[PDB]
């Protein structure tokens, strides 16, 4: 087979979006009201409860990173 | 909208009394005539137990309290302001059916937390 894409990708050089379209998004965010609150609630559902890190088999390492043992999760 | 309701209640939330004097296609009535009629039917000196006595060419008429749903306007205003501030509808002292129970409620408590 091959190591790089051979099927084409349907977009190059334009006719696909601009700083103006992006500044409309900024305006929808900063202008408030129920419209802004729904998207902020959407963000809070997806990301507001926090996060956790693990590393697969981390404790196979106890490296002397600064003269004392550490793991990659600690790092 | 609050200022609008506050004014509108004084005008429209209460009745008013309209005394009509003279007859249809009848004799003319002037200000110094009405001043005497006003002195008789004066709300300032009227009591709840009163009775009125007239000829056929004096009428008492009612401007009713011309009802409007200011409560629902309050609820819409509060719905707007609470959700604009990101607060739940309940924080505005506004209730809704169903939305106080189960996962329909608990989702909004989750969003708040």
B111 touches chain A (CB under 8 A): yes
Is A41 close to B111, i.e. CB distance below 8 A?
A: yes
Can you tell me the distance from the alpha carbon of B55 to that of B27, in angstroms, rounded to the nearest whole number? 14
Per the listing, tokens 């793991």 go with: A71
Can you tell me the distance from the alpha carbon of B40 to that of B34, in angstroms, rounded to the nearest whole number? 10
Neighbours of B83 (CB within 10 A): 19
Contact indicator for B57, B22 with CB cutoff of 8 Å: yes
Spell out the residues 6+ positions from residue A17 whose beta carbon is closer than 8 angstroms to its own.
none
Can you tell me the distance from the alpha carbon of B35 to that of B12, in angstroms, rounded to the nearest whole number? 25
Contact indicator for B17, B60 with CB cutoff of 8 Å: yes
B84 touches chain A (CB under 8 A): yes
Is A37 close to B86, i.e. CB distance below 8 A?
A: yes
* Resolution of the structure in the document, Å: 2.4
Contact indicator for B4, B58 with CB cutoff of 8 Å: no
Is A45 close to B111, i.e. CB distance below 8 A?
A: yes
């Amino acid at each position: 087979a091959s190591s790089t894409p051979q099927t084409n990708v349907d977009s190059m050089g334009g006719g696909d979006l601009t700083f103006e379209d992006l500044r409309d998004i900024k305006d929808v965010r900063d202008s408030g009201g129920q419209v802004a609150q729904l998207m902020d609630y959407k963000a809070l559902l997806n990301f507001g409860e926090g996060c956790e890190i693990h590393v697969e088999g981390d404790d196979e390492t106890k490296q002397l990173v600064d003269g004392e043992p550490m793991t990659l999760s600690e790092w | 909208n609050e200022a609008a309701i506050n004014q509108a209640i004084e005008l429209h939330g209460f009745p008013q009394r309209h005394v009509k004097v003279g007859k249809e296609d009848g004799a003319p009535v002037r200000d110094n005539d009405l001043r005497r009629v006003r002195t008789i039917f004066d709300p300032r000196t009227t009591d709840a137990n009163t009775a009125y006595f007239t000829g056929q060419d004096v009428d008492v008429e009612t401007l009713e309290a011309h009802n409007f749903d200011y409560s629902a306007i309050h609820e819409m205003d509060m719905r707007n302001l609470t959700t604009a501030l990101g607060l739940p509808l309940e924080a505005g002292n506004v209730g809704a059916d169903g939305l106080g129970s189960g996962k329909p409620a608990e989702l909004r408590f989750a969003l708040l937390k």
